[PDB]
Amino acid sequence: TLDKYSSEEILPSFEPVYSWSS
Amino acid sequence: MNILKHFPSYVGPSKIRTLVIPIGHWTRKEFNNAVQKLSEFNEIHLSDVTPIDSPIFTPQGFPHGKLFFDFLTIDHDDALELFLYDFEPFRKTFVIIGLVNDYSDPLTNLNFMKEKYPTLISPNLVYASSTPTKELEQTIDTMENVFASSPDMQKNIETIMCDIARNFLTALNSYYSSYKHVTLRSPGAIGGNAVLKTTLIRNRSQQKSLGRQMKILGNFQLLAGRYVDALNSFVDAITTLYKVRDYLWLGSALDGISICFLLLSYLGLSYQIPQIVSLICPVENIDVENINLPLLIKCISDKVLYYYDLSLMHNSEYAPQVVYCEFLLKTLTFMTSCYKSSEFSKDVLDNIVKNQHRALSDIPNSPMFPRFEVYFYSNKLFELQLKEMQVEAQIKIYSTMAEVYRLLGYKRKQLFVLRLLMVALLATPNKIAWHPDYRTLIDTI
Amino acid sequence: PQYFAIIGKKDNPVYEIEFTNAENPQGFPQDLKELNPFILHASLDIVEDLQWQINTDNCYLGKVDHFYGLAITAYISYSGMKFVMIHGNSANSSVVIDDNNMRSFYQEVHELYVKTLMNPFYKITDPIRSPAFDSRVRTLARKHLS
Amino acid sequence: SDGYEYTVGPKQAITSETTYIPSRIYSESLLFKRQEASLSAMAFLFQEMISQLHRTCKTAGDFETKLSDYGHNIGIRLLELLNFRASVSPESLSNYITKMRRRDLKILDILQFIHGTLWSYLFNHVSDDLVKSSERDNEYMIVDNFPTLTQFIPGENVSCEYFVCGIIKGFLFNAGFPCGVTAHRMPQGGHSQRTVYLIQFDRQVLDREG
């Protein structure tokens, strides 16, 4: 399930949690 | 995290934007909880910070003063919002606090941090480690811009946030010292046709330069956290900037002195409303107690909106559409904040500054503004062309209008503006990554 | 052009229609066609807000809401029936609403609704599926609306 | 064919383009054609409708709800239309009017309207002694000395009179005033054919009024 699958992940270090534009 | 649920605050320009980053091997849930708890100590009084050598930002310059913080995580699109830093500095983020849990070397970590973020001024990092070794403890507590706390951020967060303020004041003082010898030309002059001129669908140099410099001096004080002198600077900024008929900068100066009025009221100090603001904008010299503050704020806001309108026909000194729209949102949310009580009390002054919404409440008879003036003012937002700016401005505008209508109790109007948000998000020509808040948005619709 | 609707207390339409002027007979171009129900649903909230107030006539509300050149006018009958419509430009104008033509238009449309409400087989929830009613409303639109 | 057709949505109608149909109800006016008939026919229809509900029902609550529902379909049609006639100040009727009765949007105005105009229409005489009990919180009431419809119904119990209760229930419900209207019997004044329709308003309206 996506909701729980995305809850625990390995974040890209030295980057924000969520960027908007490319 | 709270992504597409913006609700600005009128003391936002006083608030300090700080970008937070997940160094190491964290998870989404743990990092979100960490930053959420870290966003609970953003009222670091200036009394508990130790002094700084230089005078114009010494924390030992005013017994009161709250020194807000605004923790955020979204990396806004730089290289287009970079241009309007001369016009106002608080747009630029200043201080980075990086959460780290890898037991790695702080020196190399922050070296690469600075290499990645050259634009930003004050970097620093904090270890969320469970019992790091004494060899690392000696290294970290030797240096200032590195700190450490136990996981869940509950060991020394108060003193840590005290010290972040302490370094931030020095870093901003260095920035202003490097920055106080610049021409300060308007963003239209800087960028040419790089910022949209808010297409609606409805002896003259030295004095101007001195006025702009006095403005930016006062604005830096306002962001730094010493506000009585900020007011005293804003007075002689505005009075000098009025005669030279530079409408654009005068508008922001008037906005800043209005913010000073509100926040000095929040701090509960007496102050006279100056003759210059009394002359430039009527009230319809005198202490604040003998005037209803919200009406003063409203007429000030209306007059600065009038000046932003009056500053459109000049080709390279036109107010940017992003600033115009953001200011409109700011005034709208201020009106909604006022529309919750007949008394303009410490409760609502706490609400407006701390940003607690308090969804649904008992209506008292005869509030400040009726529930038609707020809607009529919010209708001004559609008068400007909205489906041409980019996605950050679009989502912020539509989301805060949705929250505005929700507080006003116009449920189907909230549905309408949320539908506008959804189609605007659909129409963007770029891939967007998943977040758990689109879930909430669709569920709410 | 114009787009007119009759809506009941449960917030569902019992009638909708759209009038051109024969210069641009496709009506609202392509996007406002999709946007008409949502702007009208938005205006319904203000109509409901003015529905229960003190302050002379109060059945006709006149210009109640604004949008990109759209003038939104509303009339409230006695059962909570809301006759709401939106007037648009002729592709470029600052369109203004008449003060008496639309008044009399709502008067006669309310007459028609009153006399088609009486028959025992018509329920409030069910729509007004009547060719005679449609013909009468549109020939009224020709006479009054423009 | 040219109807609304709610599934497809609003059709496009050209203003310039007109051939009317003989509807036989839209053409027929509704001004006030008086065609008053005998009370006997109304009474016989009333008793037979009561008898048919009396067969169909199983309990007093079922009879209650069924007769109230039967009367609820007359108030819906009376509320628009009676106000619309009263809007007339002394062929399309709309070309004889300038302004309407406002909306009787207040609780007192709507209840006074039922006291004055509705009853004078139904039973040809204004009702007597409208009252509100200022005891519990709010209990409005309209009393009749001699109910015309259920006059022939015998028995000290009152349940066959709820036709009128449904009429007022619909009249108040469609005007934005939900209620729990109910009838009761009380001899006070030597009549003993005295009936009180108690109107009990809802918390929504109670908060709305103040």
PDB file of N, CA and C in Angstrom, chain B residues 225-283:
ATOM      1  N   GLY B 225      14.717  42.118  15.036  1.00  0.00           N
ATOM      2  CA  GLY B 225      13.934  41.936  16.247  1.00  0.00           C
ATOM      3  C   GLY B 225      13.929  43.089  17.231  1.00  0.00           C
ATOM      4  N   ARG B 226      14.309  44.285  16.790  1.00  0.00           N
ATOM      5  CA  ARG B 226      14.289  45.491  17.617  1.00  0.00           C
ATOM      6  C   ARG B 226      13.382  46.495  16.920  1.00  0.00           C
ATOM      7  N   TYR B 227      12.206  46.756  17.502  1.00  0.00           N
ATOM      8  CA  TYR B 227      11.118  47.351  16.734  1.00  0.00           C
ATOM      9  C   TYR B 227      10.804  48.795  17.087  1.00  0.00           C
ATOM     10  N   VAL B 228      11.140  49.272  18.286  1.00  0.00           N
ATOM     11  CA  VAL B 228      10.905  50.682  18.591  1.00  0.00           C
ATOM     12  C   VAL B 228      11.795  51.566  17.720  1.00  0.00           C
ATOM     13  N   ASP B 229      13.077  51.217  17.617  1.00  0.00           N
ATOM     14  CA  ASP B 229      13.953  51.927  16.695  1.00  0.00           C
ATOM     15  C   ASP B 229      13.552  51.672  15.249  1.00  0.00           C
ATOM     16  N   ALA B 230      12.970  50.507  14.959  1.00  0.00           N
ATOM     17  CA  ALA B 230      12.451  50.262  13.616  1.00  0.00           C
ATOM     18  C   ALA B 230      11.334  51.238  13.280  1.00  0.00           C
ATOM     19  N   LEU B 231      10.440  51.489  14.237  1.00  0.00           N
ATOM     20  CA  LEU B 231       9.398  52.492  14.052  1.00  0.00           C
ATOM     21  C   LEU B 231       9.998  53.877  13.857  1.00  0.00           C
ATOM     22  N   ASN B 232      10.979  54.229  14.691  1.00  0.00           N
ATOM     23  CA  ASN B 232      11.583  55.553  14.585  1.00  0.00           C
ATOM     24  C   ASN B 232      12.302  55.732  13.254  1.00  0.00           C
ATOM     25  N   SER B 233      12.813  54.643  12.678  1.00  0.00           N
ATOM     26  CA  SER B 233      13.412  54.695  11.350  1.00  0.00           C
ATOM     27  C   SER B 233      12.352  54.748  10.256  1.00  0.00           C
ATOM     28  N   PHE B 234      11.247  54.026  10.437  1.00  0.00           N
ATOM     29  CA  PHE B 234      10.204  54.017   9.422  1.00  0.00           C
ATOM     30  C   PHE B 234       9.553  55.383   9.283  1.00  0.00           C
ATOM     31  N   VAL B 235       9.437  56.128  10.385  1.00  0.00           N
ATOM     32  CA  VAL B 235       8.838  57.464  10.318  1.00  0.00           C
ATOM     33  C   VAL B 235       9.627  58.360   9.367  1.00  0.00           C
ATOM     34  N   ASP B 236      10.917  58.552   9.651  1.00  0.00           N
ATOM     35  CA  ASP B 236      11.726  59.417   8.801  1.00  0.00           C
ATOM     36  C   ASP B 236      12.067  58.774   7.463  1.00  0.00           C
ATOM     37  N   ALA B 237      11.816  57.475   7.290  1.00  0.00           N
ATOM     38  CA  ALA B 237      11.867  56.902   5.950  1.00  0.00           C
ATOM     39  C   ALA B 237      10.667  57.346   5.125  1.00  0.00           C
ATOM     40  N   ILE B 238       9.465  57.190   5.682  1.00  0.00           N
ATOM     41  CA  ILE B 238       8.247  57.470   4.931  1.00  0.00           C
ATOM     42  C   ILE B 238       8.125  58.960   4.643  1.00  0.00           C
ATOM     43  N   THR B 239       8.454  59.808   5.623  1.00  0.00           N
ATOM     44  CA  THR B 239       8.258  61.239   5.406  1.00  0.00           C
ATOM     45  C   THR B 239       9.194  61.769   4.328  1.00  0.00           C
ATOM     46  N   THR B 240      10.402  61.212   4.226  1.00  0.00           N
ATOM     47  CA  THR B 240      11.323  61.603   3.167  1.00  0.00           C
ATOM     48  C   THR B 240      10.959  60.966   1.834  1.00  0.00           C
ATOM     49  N   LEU B 241      10.406  59.755   1.854  1.00  0.00           N
ATOM     50  CA  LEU B 241      10.057  59.072   0.618  1.00  0.00           C
ATOM     51  C   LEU B 241       8.738  59.549   0.026  1.00  0.00           C
ATOM     52  N   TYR B 242       7.930  60.287   0.790  1.00  0.00           N
ATOM     53  CA  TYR B 242       6.674  60.796   0.249  1.00  0.00           C
ATOM     54  C   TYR B 242       6.906  61.958  -0.707  1.00  0.00           C
ATOM     55  N   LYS B 243       7.806  62.878  -0.356  1.00  0.00           N
ATOM     56  CA  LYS B 243       7.984  64.070  -1.177  1.00  0.00           C
ATOM     57  C   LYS B 243       8.610  63.742  -2.529  1.00  0.00           C
ATOM     58  N   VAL B 244       9.447  62.701  -2.598  1.00  0.00           N
ATOM     59  CA  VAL B 244      10.094  62.335  -3.858  1.00  0.00           C
ATOM     60  C   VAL B 244       9.181  61.554  -4.792  1.00  0.00           C
ATOM     61  N   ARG B 245       7.939  61.271  -4.382  1.00  0.00           N
ATOM     62  CA  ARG B 245       6.943  60.539  -5.177  1.00  0.00           C
ATOM     63  C   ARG B 245       7.515  59.257  -5.786  1.00  0.00           C
ATOM     64  N   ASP B 246       8.029  58.390  -4.913  1.00  0.00           N
ATOM     65  CA  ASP B 246       8.439  57.031  -5.272  1.00  0.00           C
ATOM     66  C   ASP B 246       7.396  56.122  -4.626  1.00  0.00           C
ATOM     67  N   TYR B 247       6.313  55.871  -5.365  1.00  0.00           N
ATOM     68  CA  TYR B 247       5.148  55.207  -4.786  1.00  0.00           C
ATOM     69  C   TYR B 247       5.465  53.776  -4.374  1.00  0.00           C
ATOM     70  N   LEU B 248       6.248  53.069  -5.193  1.00  0.00           N
ATOM     71  CA  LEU B 248       6.438  51.635  -4.998  1.00  0.00           C
ATOM     72  C   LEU B 248       7.110  51.348  -3.663  1.00  0.00           C
ATOM     73  N   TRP B 249       8.236  52.006  -3.394  1.00  0.00           N
ATOM     74  CA  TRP B 249       8.938  51.763  -2.142  1.00  0.00           C
ATOM     75  C   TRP B 249       8.150  52.303  -0.956  1.00  0.00           C
ATOM     76  N   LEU B 250       7.449  53.423  -1.147  1.00  0.00           N
ATOM     77  CA  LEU B 250       6.638  53.981  -0.072  1.00  0.00           C
ATOM     78  C   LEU B 250       5.556  53.007   0.358  1.00  0.00           C
ATOM     79  N   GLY B 251       4.999  52.255  -0.590  1.00  0.00           N
ATOM     80  CA  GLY B 251       3.988  51.280  -0.222  1.00  0.00           C
ATOM     81  C   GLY B 251       4.521  50.242   0.747  1.00  0.00           C
ATOM     82  N   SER B 252       5.678  49.664   0.431  1.00  0.00           N
ATOM     83  CA  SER B 252       6.266  48.684   1.334  1.00  0.00           C
ATOM     84  C   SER B 252       6.669  49.315   2.660  1.00  0.00           C
ATOM     85  N   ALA B 253       7.120  50.572   2.643  1.00  0.00           N
ATOM     86  CA  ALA B 253       7.470  51.238   3.896  1.00  0.00           C
ATOM     87  C   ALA B 253       6.246  51.400   4.786  1.00  0.00           C
ATOM     88  N   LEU B 254       5.123  51.790   4.187  1.00  0.00           N
ATOM     89  CA  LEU B 254       3.888  51.938   4.940  1.00  0.00           C
ATOM     90  C   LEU B 254       3.413  50.588   5.472  1.00  0.00           C
ATOM     91  N   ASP B 255       3.578  49.533   4.673  1.00  0.00           N
ATOM     92  CA  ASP B 255       3.254  48.192   5.149  1.00  0.00           C
ATOM     93  C   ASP B 255       4.101  47.823   6.360  1.00  0.00           C
ATOM     94  N   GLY B 256       5.398  48.123   6.304  1.00  0.00           N
ATOM     95  CA  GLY B 256       6.274  47.785   7.412  1.00  0.00           C
ATOM     96  C   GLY B 256       5.922  48.528   8.687  1.00  0.00           C
ATOM     97  N   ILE B 257       5.617  49.822   8.576  1.00  0.00           N
ATOM     98  CA  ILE B 257       5.269  50.559   9.789  1.00  0.00           C
ATOM     99  C   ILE B 257       3.931  50.075  10.339  1.00  0.00           C
ATOM    100  N   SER B 258       3.014  49.638   9.470  1.00  0.00           N
ATOM    101  CA  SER B 258       1.786  49.026   9.969  1.00  0.00           C
ATOM    102  C   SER B 258       2.083  47.746  10.746  1.00  0.00           C
ATOM    103  N   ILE B 259       2.978  46.908  10.219  1.00  0.00           N
ATOM    104  CA  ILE B 259       3.389  45.706  10.946  1.00  0.00           C
ATOM    105  C   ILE B 259       3.980  46.082  12.299  1.00  0.00           C
ATOM    106  N   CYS B 260       4.753  47.169  12.338  1.00  0.00           N
ATOM    107  CA  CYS B 260       5.295  47.637  13.609  1.00  0.00           C
ATOM    108  C   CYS B 260       4.181  48.012  14.574  1.00  0.00           C
ATOM    109  N   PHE B 261       3.149  48.705  14.081  1.00  0.00           N
ATOM    110  CA  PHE B 261       2.003  49.038  14.926  1.00  0.00           C
ATOM    111  C   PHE B 261       1.417  47.781  15.554  1.00  0.00           C
ATOM    112  N   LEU B 262       1.120  46.777  14.720  1.00  0.00           N
ATOM    113  CA  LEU B 262       0.484  45.563  15.234  1.00  0.00           C
ATOM    114  C   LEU B 262       1.355  44.883  16.272  1.00  0.00           C
ATOM    115  N   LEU B 263       2.637  44.719  15.971  1.00  0.00           N
ATOM    116  CA  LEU B 263       3.451  43.910  16.859  1.00  0.00           C
ATOM    117  C   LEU B 263       3.819  44.647  18.138  1.00  0.00           C
ATOM    118  N   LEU B 264       3.978  45.970  18.090  1.00  0.00           N
ATOM    119  CA  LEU B 264       4.140  46.708  19.334  1.00  0.00           C
ATOM    120  C   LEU B 264       2.873  46.624  20.176  1.00  0.00           C
ATOM    121  N   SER B 265       1.699  46.623  19.531  1.00  0.00           N
ATOM    122  CA  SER B 265       0.468  46.372  20.275  1.00  0.00           C
ATOM    123  C   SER B 265       0.504  45.000  20.935  1.00  0.00           C
ATOM    124  N   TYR B 266       1.005  43.996  20.216  1.00  0.00           N
ATOM    125  CA  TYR B 266       1.095  42.650  20.776  1.00  0.00           C
ATOM    126  C   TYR B 266       2.030  42.616  21.977  1.00  0.00           C
ATOM    127  N   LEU B 267       3.164  43.311  21.884  1.00  0.00           N
ATOM    128  CA  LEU B 267       4.081  43.423  23.012  1.00  0.00           C
ATOM    129  C   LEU B 267       3.557  44.332  24.117  1.00  0.00           C
ATOM    130  N   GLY B 268       2.479  45.070  23.878  1.00  0.00           N
ATOM    131  CA  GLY B 268       1.858  45.835  24.940  1.00  0.00           C
ATOM    132  C   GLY B 268       2.685  47.007  25.418  1.00  0.00           C
ATOM    133  N   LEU B 269       3.201  47.787  24.475  1.00  0.00           N
ATOM    134  CA  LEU B 269       3.876  49.046  24.753  1.00  0.00           C
ATOM    135  C   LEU B 269       3.058  50.191  24.172  1.00  0.00           C
ATOM    136  N   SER B 270       3.118  51.339  24.835  1.00  0.00           N
ATOM    137  CA  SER B 270       2.443  52.530  24.343  1.00  0.00           C
ATOM    138  C   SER B 270       3.278  53.199  23.260  1.00  0.00           C
ATOM    139  N   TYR B 271       2.603  53.830  22.300  1.00  0.00           N
ATOM    140  CA  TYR B 271       3.301  54.536  21.233  1.00  0.00           C
ATOM    141  C   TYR B 271       2.289  55.434  20.543  1.00  0.00           C
ATOM    142  N   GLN B 272       2.708  56.642  20.189  1.00  0.00           N
ATOM    143  CA  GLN B 272       1.840  57.548  19.452  1.00  0.00           C
ATOM    144  C   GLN B 272       1.850  57.201  17.971  1.00  0.00           C
ATOM    145  N   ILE B 273       0.696  57.340  17.332  1.00  0.00           N
ATOM    146  CA  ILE B 273       0.641  57.193  15.874  1.00  0.00           C
ATOM    147  C   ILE B 273       1.229  58.453  15.240  1.00  0.00           C
ATOM    148  N   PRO B 274       2.264  58.365  14.403  1.00  0.00           N
ATOM    149  CA  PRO B 274       2.967  59.587  14.001  1.00  0.00           C
ATOM    150  C   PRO B 274       2.133  60.491  13.103  1.00  0.00           C
ATOM    151  N   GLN B 275       2.495  61.775  13.150  1.00  0.00           N
ATOM    152  CA  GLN B 275       1.806  62.769  12.341  1.00  0.00           C
ATOM    153  C   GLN B 275       1.936  62.471  10.857  1.00  0.00           C
ATOM    154  N   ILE B 276       3.018  61.812  10.435  1.00  0.00           N
ATOM    155  CA  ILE B 276       3.193  61.561   9.009  1.00  0.00           C
ATOM    156  C   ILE B 276       2.175  60.541   8.509  1.00  0.00           C
ATOM    157  N   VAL B 277       1.964  59.443   9.244  1.00  0.00           N
ATOM    158  CA  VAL B 277       0.958  58.483   8.794  1.00  0.00           C
ATOM    159  C   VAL B 277      -0.433  59.083   8.948  1.00  0.00           C
ATOM    160  N   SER B 278      -0.650  59.852  10.022  1.00  0.00           N
ATOM    161  CA  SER B 278      -1.947  60.495  10.206  1.00  0.00           C
ATOM    162  C   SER B 278      -2.260  61.446   9.055  1.00  0.00           C
ATOM    163  N   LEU B 279      -1.247  62.160   8.555  1.00  0.00           N
ATOM    164  CA  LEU B 279      -1.454  63.070   7.436  1.00  0.00           C
ATOM    165  C   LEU B 279      -1.626  62.317   6.126  1.00  0.00           C
ATOM    166  N   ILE B 280      -0.782  61.314   5.873  1.00  0.00           N
ATOM    167  CA  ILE B 280      -0.811  60.682   4.562  1.00  0.00           C
ATOM    168  C   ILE B 280      -2.100  59.889   4.385  1.00  0.00           C
ATOM    169  N   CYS B 281      -2.579  59.215   5.441  1.00  0.00           N
ATOM    170  CA  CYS B 281      -3.814  58.437   5.392  1.00  0.00           C
ATOM    171  C   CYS B 281      -4.699  58.932   6.534  1.00  0.00           C
ATOM    172  N   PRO B 282      -5.971  59.254   6.291  1.00  0.00           N
ATOM    173  CA  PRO B 282      -6.818  59.726   7.389  1.00  0.00           C
ATOM    174  C   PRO B 282      -7.258  58.572   8.278  1.00  0.00           C
ATOM    175  N   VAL B 283      -7.861  58.939   9.408  1.00  0.00           N
ATOM    176  CA  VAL B 283      -8.302  57.981  10.417  1.00  0.00           C
ATOM    177  C   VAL B 283      -9.817  57.821  10.350  1.00  0.00           C
TER     178      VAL B 283
END
